[PDB]
């Protein structure tokens, strides 16, 4: 085999897990962590929901969108809906 000798150095801080790989001891440390929280307007995750407000509050606050029925551009994701619910409405 091409791979290094025994020995296992990468370690974890809050279990006995061990291994020889750094990638091996950061996949394994993905399971002591806390709970995602994912944004709703983009790919952005953090371990603090209240950053996450933040987040959206600065990043997605006043967002310009389109409509799905349309393609008539919205200044806001609020606005958008009163539109659907005048215009485009589900009859319930
Ligand atoms: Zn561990
Ligand atoms: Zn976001
Ligand atoms: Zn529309």
Redesign the pocket.
Known sequence: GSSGSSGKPYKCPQCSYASAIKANLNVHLRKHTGEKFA?D??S?TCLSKGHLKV??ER??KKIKQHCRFCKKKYSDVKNLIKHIRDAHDPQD
């Open positions: 944004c307007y983009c952005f987040h959206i990043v997605h």
